[PDB]
Design an enzyme around this catalytic site. Structure first.
Site, short mmCIF file in Angstrom:
data_model
loop_
_atom_site.label_atom_id
_atom_site.label_comp_id
_atom_site.label_asym_id
_atom_site.label_seq_id
_atom_site.Cartn_x
_atom_site.Cartn_y
_atom_site.Cartn_z
N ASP C 57 1.17 -0.85 0.03
CA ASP C 57 0.26 0.00 -0.04
C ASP C 57 1.23 1.29 0.08
O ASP C 57 1.67 1.42 0.79
CB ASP C 57 -0.88 -0.26 1.28
CG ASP C 57 -1.45 0.92 1.55
OD1 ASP C 57 -2.60 0.99 0.67
OD2 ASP C 57 -1.39 2.29 1.94
N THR C 90 -5.08 5.67 -3.06
CA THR C 90 -3.60 5.77 -2.53
C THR C 90 -2.40 5.72 -3.47
O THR C 90 -1.78 6.67 -3.54
CB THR C 90 -3.35 5.15 -1.11
OG1 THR C 90 -3.40 3.48 -1.42
CG2 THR C 90 -4.64 5.53 -0.35
N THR C 91 -1.98 4.74 -4.05
CA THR C 91 -0.84 4.32 -5.09
C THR C 91 -1.69 5.38 -6.58
O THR C 91 -0.54 5.03 -7.00
CB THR C 91 -1.49 3.02 -5.23
OG1 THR C 91 -2.53 2.46 -5.68
CG2 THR C 91 -0.87 2.21 -3.76
N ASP C 394 -15.35 -7.53 -1.68
CA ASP C 394 -15.21 -7.07 -3.36
C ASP C 394 -16.79 -6.65 -3.29
O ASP C 394 -16.87 -5.59 -3.61
CB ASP C 394 -14.71 -7.65 -4.59
CG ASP C 394 -13.30 -8.08 -4.06
OD1 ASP C 394 -12.41 -6.49 -3.62
OD2 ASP C 394 -12.46 -8.66 -4.60
#
Lengths: 510, 513, 534
Positions: C57, C90-91, C394
Site C-alpha cells: 500500500d 492512494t497508490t 469486493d
C-alpha cells in the site's frame, strides 16, 4: 600453462567459458540474420565501404577472431552456404544456444563424451524424423510457383519483404531450363546488377549480361566468336617487361604511331581470328575502334576480372594482354553475341543456352548497388536452393516451423534414452526454439509465449514466425502451409552441419 | 526524501542468502550428513548441523537471512521439525525459478507455480504416502524412528520414540486421543537432570516438578484434592497492614514480612482443613509453604491453572474455595500413577494421566542432563511423528525421493499443463530434486545417473515409496528400508517454503525507515 | 540533493531543485508504482534494522518515509490525505503527480496569465469528473442483471474462492438489507460489515446460512446451564454472576482467609437466585455477558442454572437494538439478588435455539423493532469462512459504494486511458497554453494502468495495446454499454469480461483522487520569491 612453456589458447575458462562466448557472441547477430528479417547490420570493409548483409558469411568472413572453433564453425556455415544457401545464418545461431546447454551440463558437470553422443544420436534421431518432416517437395522447376516458393523462403529468411517479387523473378529466370538433374549453372546465370532504374525494374535477362560498355561497331555476327583478352587494346603501350615497367625510356613513344597499323592489323586479326567481339580489359581507343569499325568487331571497352574470368570461363576464353594482332584459342561458346541496352545502359549480351550449359544472366536494376549487392545476397539464397539436385527437394516446412515437430519428440525421446546421454538429447531438442525465439524477438516476442504455443499446437510442421504481427502474439504463421517450405537437403545440412562442429569443437583444451 | 530501490539487487541478495543458507544445511541433511561450524568473532567455534542454531548466533542480515529464521521458527514450533528443510527448500525453489523466469522477465507466473506445485506435491504425497497404524507403536516406530535419525541424532531413535510412542497416543485434547491439532502443551517435556535412561521410562502423563519439591510435601497420596485459591489461600495475598509506621525505619522490614504473614494465614487455612494438594497460579510464598510442608499438602505453584486444571482433573481433584466450602464434588482421582522420583535433591512428581489432555509432561532421561535434552529434541520430533501418525497415519517413504516424486509429477503435470507456466512449474520442479541429490551425492559417484535411475524409477518403479537411499544412493524402497518422510512434515515444510521465496519475489525494494 | 554545496534549504532557485523535485517526486512516486494496486508486490521495508514491514500500500509506505523534500512531502501527505478520504487511489494519486507537477509548474512560467495552466489540470479533472459519473460503461452496480446480487456473484466470481459465490451472491445484498441503519445525513447507506456475520465452518464450504433477525453466536459446550428454552424473549444482559468475588467486605485488612470464605460462600447462591429472578420476570432465555473461573465453571456448570453467558456484545447490542431488548435496564450492578424487569427482554416472534452444522446460535426470529438478518457462513474449515469472506468484501463495498454515490468508473487506468486522447483533443482544439496543459494532464494519466498491469506482470505495451485500442474517439461515449471495453480488472492486469465486478472502482474516489492528483502538482507551485535563512 603452469610453466615457462606450453603456448595454449584454450582450457579452463577458455575451453569452458570463452569458447562458449564466441559461440554465443557470434550467434548473436545470426539470431537476427536467419528467418524472415529486414535486420540492418552495417558492415564496411578495410575500405570502410558501407554494406548490410542478412547472411552470416558477410558478417562472418568480415570478422576476425582468435577462437579457432568460432573460426572453424563458419566452415560448416560455409559448408552450408557451399552445399546450400539461406539457412547459413541458422547454422551458427543453432549451435551457440545448443552449446551453452553443454556448459550448463558442465554446470551440471556432465562428461564430454557423455554430452557428445546426446547431440549425435538425437541428430540422427532428428535426421530420423527430418524425412518424416518432409511435407512436400519442389515439384517442377518448370513451375514458377514451385521455384518462387523455393525462392520465397530463401529470400524471406534473409529478406522477408522483397521475397516473393524476386521469388517470381528468379523463378521466371527460368533457371528451370537447367533441369537440376545434375546440371545447373550457378555462375553462368549470375546476376549482373544495373545501378539505376528500380529494383522492381530489376529483372532477369537470358544470355550473359555484361553491363560494361560496348565499343567498336557491334559484333559482325551473333554467335560472334569471342576474343576475351586482358589487354588486347590497352593501347599499344608495352605489355612486354617481366615486371611490366620501363627498361629504357624510349619504348612508350613508338606506341602512338604504329598504333594505327597495329590497332588495324590487331583488330584486323580479330576480324581474321573469327572473333566479332574482342573483349578489352585494357582501354578502348579510337584506332582500334576505327578499325574495329572497319572490321565491325565489338570491343568490350574495359573489364572486371568478373567480366574476364566469366568470359574466360563461360566462353572457354583466355584473357591475355595483346599488342600484336591476336588469335582465338577463345572463339565463342556463345551462339548469340549482343550489344543490348538493358537497364537503358549499353550492355554487352553474350548468349548461348542449353538445358545443360545455358547462360541466363539475371539483370538487376536499382538506384543503389548497396541495394542489389545485399539483394543478390538475398537473391543468391534461392539461386542456391535451386541447386539441390533433387528436383523434388523433399521440402520440409521452412522458417523453423517443423522444429517443434522434432523439438518435442527428440527431447521426449530425450528422457526415453537414459543417463547423462539423455540430457544432451533433451538439450539437443531444446535448441530448436532459439531460431524462432531469435526470430520472434526480431518481431519482439519471447519464445515461451511463442513456443508454448508451438508446444500447444503440437504436431503441425506449420506454426513458426519471426517477422510479422502473427509473429508477435499468435505464434502462428505458416512456415509450412503459406508457401514457406524448405528442402530436406538444406534442412538436413541445417541439422547435419549444426550437429557436426558443435560436438567436434567441444574437445579442445588448446 | 528521495529514494528508490531497483529490481534484481534485492532479488539477487535474496537468491544469494537463499541458496547459501541452504548449502551446508542440505549437506548436513540426510543419513550422510555434514556439519556447519561457525567461528565466533571472539574465536569460539560453533559446530551444528542446524544453521538456525548457527545463523541466529552469528550475523543475521536484512535480506532473507532475516526471512529464513522466521520461517525456520515457523517450522520449529508447529510440527516440531522440518527446521532444516524450509531454508534448503526456499533457497532451492527461488534460485532455479526466479532468474531463468526473471530472464523470462515476470514475477507473477512464478508466484502461481508455487500453488501449482503445492497441490501436485500434496497429490503425489497423499497418493504415495503410506498409511501406518496409529495404535501400533511398532508401525509407529519405523515411521517415527526415521524422523529421529534425520538431523544429528540416531541415539534416541529407539528410546525417545519409545517414550514418545505411547504418551502421545495417551494424550488427548480439549477437542480430543491427542491427534487433531498441534497442541504441544500436550506434548510437554520436563527434564530430570542427570538420572539414567533406566530410571527413565515412558510417562504417558504429566509431571509437575513443582508438585513435590521436598520430602515434606504430600507424597504418593493418590486421591488428590487440588484447590484453586479463592478462600483458603485467597486471590489477594496483600499485607495485613497492622501497626504500620511511615515514621519508623523498623517498619520497612515489617511490610515485606507482612506480605507473607497474610499468606501465612492463607496456607494456614489449608492446614486447618488439609486438602492434600494446593495449587496457586500467582505462586505461594515460602514462609506459608513451610506450614504446607508441615501438613503433607503438596504445594503446586509456578505451573498454570489451565496446566493444573488439565493436571487436576487428570490426576483427580475436588477444587474448592476452601474445603469448608464445597462448590460441588468432582472425581477424587483421574490418574493411575502418582510418582515422585528424586534425582538430585529435587523431587520430580510424575503423575501418569492416562488418556488425558493434561499437560502430558513426559518422564525422560539421558545419562546426564545434556543428553537428557536430545531425548526431548528427538521426543518432540518423535511425539511430532507420534501425533503425525495420529494426525496423518498416511506419510510418505523417501530419501528425498518425494522431492523427486513431486518434481517429475510436477513435470508430468507440467508437460500436461504446458503454457508459459510449464517452465516455472518445471523450474520449480527441478529445484526439489537437488535436495535428495545432495543426500546421495554425499553418497558419491554420479548422483545424476542416480536421478536418471530415480526418474527412471519414478514412473517405472515408484516415486517416493520405492525411493533413494540417503546413506547409499541406489534405488530402494524407503518403506522397506524403514525410512519415512512424514506427510504433514513433508507438506508443512513446503507450505512454509513456498511463501518466503514469493516474498523475496515481491521485494525488489526496502527502506531504512 | 544536487545543486551548489554552499547554499541549501531547498534553495537553488533554478530548475536544479525543480528537476530534483521532479526527481524527488519520481523516486517517491517510483516506490508506489511497484506497490501500485493489489497486484503491487508487497514490499518488505526495514523501518530501523530488525524493525521491518511488508507493504504494497502506497499510503502505508508513505507513512514510513520521512520527507525532507517538499516534492516528497506534497506527494506523501496528499495521498495520505486521499487515504483519509477513502484509501482508494492512494497508490493512484501518487504516480500521476510525478509528471503533473512538471506539468503544473512549467507553463505558468510561460505565462499566458499566471492562473491559466492550473485550472487546465482542474478542468480536465472536472471533464473527467463529469465523465466519471457518466460511466456505467464497465462495472455497473448502479444497475445490472441481478444488479447487486449478481454483482456480488460477479464480485465473488472476480475474487472467487471456489465454485461458490452463488449463496454469496445473496449474502452481500443481505449485508445492505440486514443493516437498515440508513447512514446519517439522509444516506440510504448500509454498512456491509455491520451485519452480524458469525463465522462457523462445517459441511459444504459452498454453503452459508442467513438468519431471520440478527443472530447471536454464543459459546457452546462451556455452558451446561441451559441456553435452550423455546421462547418469545431473551434477557439481554451486560451483567455477571460469579461464585468467587462479586463484592468484598473482607479484605487483607482481615488477617484470616476464612472471613472471605464466608462472603465467598454467599455469592454462589445468589447466582442461582439471579437466574430464576429472570425466570420469575418471565424470560426463559437470558443473554448474559458474565462468567466465572474454570474450576468454578466446572462446578457451576454441573450445578445448573438458566443463563447464556458471555454473549457476543456486537450481536447482543444490535439484537437488543433489533428486538427491542436493553443490555441494561434495572441492573445497576452485578449482584445476584438484584431484581430483574422486562425492559431487557427481546421482542421477536420466537427465541429458538437451532443447532445445525454442529453450530448452535441463539436465534432471535424476526426482531420486531427493525428487520434484521445475519448470514452464518459455512466453510469446509475456519479459513474457508475467511476465504469466502474476503471475496465478499469486493462484492460488499462495491454494493455499498455505488449506494454511496451512483454509477462508478471502470476500475484501473483504462477509464482514463480513453480520457487521455479525449482530453488531449479537449486540449487540441483549445490550442495555445490550453493545448499544452490540457494535453500534459491527459498524457500523465496513462502510467497507472500499465504499472498496475506491470505489478500483475501484464505490463505496459501489452496494456496500452489493450486499453486505448479498445477506447476510441469514434466511440468516446460512456454510453451505458461497451462499444469499447474501457474497464480494467485488477487481480489481473488486463481488462476482463466482468461488468458487475467489484474490482472496478466506484464513482467516488475518482472525482476525489483526480483533484488530489491535480493537487500534488499545483501544490508545489505556490512559493513566491525565494530565500535562504542563513
Amino acid at each position: 600453462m603452469l610453466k615457462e612453456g606450453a603456448k595454449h589458447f584454450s582450457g579452463l575458462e577458455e575451453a569452458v567459458y570463452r569458447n562458449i562466448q564466441a559461440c554465443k557472441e557470434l550467434a548473436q547477430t545470426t539470431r537476427t540474420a536467419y528467418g524472415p528479417n529486414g535486420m540492418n547490420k552495417m558492415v564496411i570493409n578495410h575500405l570502410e565501404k558501407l554494406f548490410v548483409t542478412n547472411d552470416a558469411a558477410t558478417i562472418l568472413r568480415e570478422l576476425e577472431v582468435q577462437h579457432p572453433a568460432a573460426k572453424m564453425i563458419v566452415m560448416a556455415s560455409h559448408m552450408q552456404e557451399q552445399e546450400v544457401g539461406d539457412g547459413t545464418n541458422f547454422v551458427l545461431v543453432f549451435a551457440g544456444a545448443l552449446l551453452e546447454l553443454a556448459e550448463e551440463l558442465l554446470r551440471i558437470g556432465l562428461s564430454v563424451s557423455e554430452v557428445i553422443e546426446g547431440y549425435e544420436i538425437a541428430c540422427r534421431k532428428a535426421h530420423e524424423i527430418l524425412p518424416n518432416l518432409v511435407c512436400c517437395s519442389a515439384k517442377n522447376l518448370r513451375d514458377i510457383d514451385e521455384v518462387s516458393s523455393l525462392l520465397r523462403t530463401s529470400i524471406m529468411s534473409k529478406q522477408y519483404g522483397n521475397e516473393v517479387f524476386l521469388a517470381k523473378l528468379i523463378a521466371q529466370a527460368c533457371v528451370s531450363i537447367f533441369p537440376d538433374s545434375g546440371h545447373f549453372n550457378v555462375d553462368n546465370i549470375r546476376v549482373c546488377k544495373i545501378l539505376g532504374s528500380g529494383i522492381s525494374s530489376s529483372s532477369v535477362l537470358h544470355g550473359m549480361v555484361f553491363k560494361k560498355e560496348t565499343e567498336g561497331d557491334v559484333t559482325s555476327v551473333k554467335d560472334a566468336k569471342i576474343a576475351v583478352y586482358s589487354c588486347p587494346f590497352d593501347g599499344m603501350i608495352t605489355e612486354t617487361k617481366g615486371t611490366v615497367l620501363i627498361k629504357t625510356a624510349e619504348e612508350l613513344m613508338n606506341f602512338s604511331k604504329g598504333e594505327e597499323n597495329l590497332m588495324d592489323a590487331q583488330v584486323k586479326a580479330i576480324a581474321d581470328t573469327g572473333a566479332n567481339v574482342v573483349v578489352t580489359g585494357g582501354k578502348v581507343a579510337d584506332m582500334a575502334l576505327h578499325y574495329a569499325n572497319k572490321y565491325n568487331i565489338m570491343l568490350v571497352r574495359l573489364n572486371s576480372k568478373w567480366d574476364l574470368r566469366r568470359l574466360c570461363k563461360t566462353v572457354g576464353a583466355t584473357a591475355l594482354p595483346r599488342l600484336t594482332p591476336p588469335v582465338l584459342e577463345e572463339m565463342g561458346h556463345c551462339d548469340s553475341v549482343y550489344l543490348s541496352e538493358v537497364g537503358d545502359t549499353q550492355v554487352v549480351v553474350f548468349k548461348h543456352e542449353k538445358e545443360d550449359g545455358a547462360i541466363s544472366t539475371i539483370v538487376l536494376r536499382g538506384s543503389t548497388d548497396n541495394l542489389m549487392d545485399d539483394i543478390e545476397r538475398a537473391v543468391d539464397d534461392g539461386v542456391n536452393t535451386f541447386k539441390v539436385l533433387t528436383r523434388d527437394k523433399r521440402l520440409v516446412p521452412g522458417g523453423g516451423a517443423t522444429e517443434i515437430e522434432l523439438a518435442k519428440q527428440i527431447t521426449s525421446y530425450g528422457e526415453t534414452c537414459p543417463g547423462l546421454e539423455q540430457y544432451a538429447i533433451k538439450k539437443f531438442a531444446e535448441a530448436f526454439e532459439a531460431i524462432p525465439r531469435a526470430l520472434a524477438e526480431n518481431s519482439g516476442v519471447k519464445a515461451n509465449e511463442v513456443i508454448s504455443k508451438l508446444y500447444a499446437v503440437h504436431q503441425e510442421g506449420n506454426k513458426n514466425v519471426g517477422l510479422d504481427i502473427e509473429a508477435e502474439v499468435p505464434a502462428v504463421k505458416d512456415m509450412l502451409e503459406a508457401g514457406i517450405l524448405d528442402t530436406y537437403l538444406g534442412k538436413y545440412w541445417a541439422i547435419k552441419l549444426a550437429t557436426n562442429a558443435a560436438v567436434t569443437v567441444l574437445r579442445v583444451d588448446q | 526524501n528521495t529514494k528508490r530501490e531497483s529490481g534484481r539487487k534485492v532479488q539477487s541478495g535474496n537468491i544469494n542468502a537463499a541458496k547459501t543458507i541452504a548449502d551446508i544445511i542440505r549437506t548436513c541433511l540426510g543419513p550422510k550428513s555434514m556439519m556447519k561450524m561457525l567461528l565466533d568473532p571472539m574465536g569460539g567455534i560453533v559446530m551444528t548441523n542446524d544453521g538456525n542454531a548457527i545463523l541466529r548466533e552469528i550475523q543475521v542480515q536484512h535480506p532473507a537471512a532475516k526471512s529464513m529464521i522466521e520461517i525456520s521458527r515457523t517450522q520449529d514450533e508447529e510440527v516440531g521439525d522440518g527446521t532444516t528443510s524450509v531454508i534448503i527448500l526456499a533457497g532451492e525453489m527461488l534460485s532455479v525459478a526466479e532468474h531463468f523466469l526473471e530472464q523470462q522477465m515476470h514475477p507473477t507466473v512464478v508466484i502461481s507455480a508455487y500453488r501449482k506445485a503445492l497441490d501436485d506435491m500434496i497429490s503425489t504425497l497423499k497418493k504415495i504416502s503410506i498409511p501406518v497404524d496409529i495404535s501400533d507403536s511398532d508401525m509407529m516406530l519405523n515411521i517415527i524412528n526415521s524422523s529421529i535419525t534425520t538431523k544429528a541424532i540416531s541415539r534416541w531413535s529407539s528410546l525417545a520414540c519409545n517414550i514418545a510412542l505411547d504418551a502421545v497416543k495417551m494424550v488427548q485434547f480439549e477437542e480430543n486421543g491427542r491427534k487433531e491439532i498441534d497442541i504441544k502443551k500436550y506434548a510437554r517435556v520436563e527434564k530430570i537432570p542427570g538420572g539414567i535412561i533406566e530410571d527413565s521410562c515412558v510417562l504417558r502423563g504429566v509431571m509437575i516438578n513443582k508438585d513435590v519439591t521436598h520430602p515434606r510435601m504430600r507424597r504418593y497420596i493418590k486421591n488428590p484434592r487440588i484447590v484453586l485459591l479463592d478462600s483458603s489461600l485467597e486471590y489477594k495475598k496483600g499485607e495485613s497492614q497492622t501497626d504500620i509506621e511511615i515514621t519508623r525505619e523498623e517498619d520497612f522490614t515489617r511490610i515485606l514480612q507482612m506480605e507473607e504473614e497474610y499468606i501465612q494465614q492463607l496456607c494456614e487455612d489449608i492446614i486447618q482443613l488439609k486438602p492434600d494438594v494446593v495449587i496457586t497460579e500467582k505462586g505461594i510464598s515460602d514462609l506459608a509453604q513451610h506450614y504446607l510442608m508441615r501438613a503433607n499438602i503438596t504445594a503446586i505453584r509456578r505451573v498454570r491453572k489451565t496446566d493444573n486444571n488439565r493436571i487436576a482433573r487428570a490426576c483427580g481433584a475436588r477444587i474448592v474455595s476452601r474445603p469448608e466450602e464445597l462448590r460441588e464434588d468432582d472425581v477424587g482421582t483421574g490418574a493411575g500413577l502418582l510418582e515422585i522420583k528424586k534425582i538430585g535433591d529435587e523431587y520430580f512428581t510424575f503423575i501418569t494421566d492416562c488418556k488425558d489432555p493434561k499437560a502430558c509432561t513426559i518422564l525422560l532421561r539421558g545419562a546426564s542432563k545434556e543428553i537428557l535434552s536430545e531425548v526431548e529434541r528427538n521426543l518432540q520430533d518423535a511425539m511430532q511423528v507420534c501425533r503425525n501418525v495420529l494426525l496423518d497415519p498416511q506419510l510418505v517413504p523417501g530419501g528425498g525421493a518425494s522431492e523427486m516424486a513431486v518434481a517429475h509429477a510436477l513435470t508430468e503435470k507440467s508437460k500436461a499443463m504446458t503454457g508459459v507456466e510449464q517452465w516455472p512449474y518445471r523450474a520449480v520442479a527441478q529445484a526439489l530434486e537437488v535436495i535428495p541429490r545432495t543426500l546421495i551425492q554425499n553418497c558419491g559417484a554420479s548422483t545424476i545417473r542416480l536421478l536418471t535411475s530415480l526418474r527412471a524409477k519414478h514412473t517405472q518403479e515408484n516415486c517416493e515409496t520405492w525411493g533413494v537411499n540417503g546413506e547409499t544412493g541406489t534405488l530402494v524402497d524407503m518403506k522397506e528400508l524403514g525410512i519415512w518422510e512424514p506427510l504433514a512434515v513433508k507438506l508443512q515444510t513446503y507450505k512454509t517454503a513456498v511463501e518466503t521465496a514469493v516474498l523475496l519475489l515481491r521485494i525488489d525494494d526496502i527502506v531504512s525507515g | 540533493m544536487e545543486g551548489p554545496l554552499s547554499v541549501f534549504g531547498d534553495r537553488s532557485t533554478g530548475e536544479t531543485i525543480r528537476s530534483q523535485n521532479v526527481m524527488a517526486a519520481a523516486s517517491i512516486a517510483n516506490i508506489v508504482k511497484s506497490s501500485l494496486g493489489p497486484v503491487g508486490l508487497d514490499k518488505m521495508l526495514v523501518d530501523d534494522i530488525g524493525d521491518v514491514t511488508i507493504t504494497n500500500d502506497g499510503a502505508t509506505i508513505l507513512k514510513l518515509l520521512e520527507v525532507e523534500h517538499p516534492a516528497a512531502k506534497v506527494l506523501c501527505e496528499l495521498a495520505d490525505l486521499q487515504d483519509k478520504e477513502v484509501g482508494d487511489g492512494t497508490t493512484s494519486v501518487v504516480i500521476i503527480a510525478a509528471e503533473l507537477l512538471k506539468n503544473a509548474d512549467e507553463l505558468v512560467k510561460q505565462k499566458i496569465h499566471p492562473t491559466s495552466v492550473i485550472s487546465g489540470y482542474r478542468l480536465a479533472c472536472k471533464e473527467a469528473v463529469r465523465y466519471i459519473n457518466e460511466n456505467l460503461i464497465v462495472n455497473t452496480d448502479e444497475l445490472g442483471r441481478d444488479c447487486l446480487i449478481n454483482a456480488a456473484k460477479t464480485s465473488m466470481s472476480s475474487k472467487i474462492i471456489g465454485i461458490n459465490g452463488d449463496f454469496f451472491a445473496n449474502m452481500v445484498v443481505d449485508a445492505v438489507l440486514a443493516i437498515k441503519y440508513t447512514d446519517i445525513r439522509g444516506q440510504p447507506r448500509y454498512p456491509v460489515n455491520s451485519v452480524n456475520i458469525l463465522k462457523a465452518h462445517g459441511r459444504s464450504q459452498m454453503e452459508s446460512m442467513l438468519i431471520s433477525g440478527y443472530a447471536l453466536n454464543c459459546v457452546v459446550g462451556s455452558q451446561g446451564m441451559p441456553k435452550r428454552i423455546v421462547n418469545a424473549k431473551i434477557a439481554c444482559l451486560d451483567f455477571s454472576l460469579q461464585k468467587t468475588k462479586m463484592k468484598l467486605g473482607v479484605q487483607v485488612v482481615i488477617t484470616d482467609p476464612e472471613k472471605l470464605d464466608q462472603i465467598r460462600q454467599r455469592e454462589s447462591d445468589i447466582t442461582k437466585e439471579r437466574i430464576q429472578k429472570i425466570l420469575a420476570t418471565g424470560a426463559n432465555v437470558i443473554l448474559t455477558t458474565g462468567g466465572i473461573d474454570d474450576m468454578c465453571l466446572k462446578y457451576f456448570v454441573e450445578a445448573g442454572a438458566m443463563a447464556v453467558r458471555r454473549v457476543l456484545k456486537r450481536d447482543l447490542k444490535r439484537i437488543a437494538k433489533a428486538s427491542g431488548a436493553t443490555i441494561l435496564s434495572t441492573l445497576a450492578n452485578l449482584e445476584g439478588e438484584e431484581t430483574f424487569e422486562a425492559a431487557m427482554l427481546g421482542q421477536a416472534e420466537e427465541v429458538v435455539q437451532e443447532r445445525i452444522c454442529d453450530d448452535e446460535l441463539i436465534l432471535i426470529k424476526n426482531t420486531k423493532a427493525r428487520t434484521s438478518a445475519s448470514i452464518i457462513l459455512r466453510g469446509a474449515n475456519d479459513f474457508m469462512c475467511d476465504e469466502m469472506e474476503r471475496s465478499l468484501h469486493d462484492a460488499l463495498c462495491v454494493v455499498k459504494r455505488v449506494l454511496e454515490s451512483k454509477s462508478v468508473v471502470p476500475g484501473g487506468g483504462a477509464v482514463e486511458a480513453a480520457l487521455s486522447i479525449y482530453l488531449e483533443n479537449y486540449a487540441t482544439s483549445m490550442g495555445s497554453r490550453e493545448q499544452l496543459a490540457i494535453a500534459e494532464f491527459a498524457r500523465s494519466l496513462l502510467v497507472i494502468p500499465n504499472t498496475l498491469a506491470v505489478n500483475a506482470a501484464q505490463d505496459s505495451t501489452d496494456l496500452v495495446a489493450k486499453l486505448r485500442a479498445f477506447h476510441n474517439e469514434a466511440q468516446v461515449n460512456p454510453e451505458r454499454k461497451n462499444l469499447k471495453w474501457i474497464g480494467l480488472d485488477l487481480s489481473n492486469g488486463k481488462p476482463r469480461d466482468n461488468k458487475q465486478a467489484g474490482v472496478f472502482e466506484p464513482t467516488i474516489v475518482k472525482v476525489k483522487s483526480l483533484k488530489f492528483a491535480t493537487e500534488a502538482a499545483i501544490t508545489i507551485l505556490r512559493i513566491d520569491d525565494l530565500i535562504k535563512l542563513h
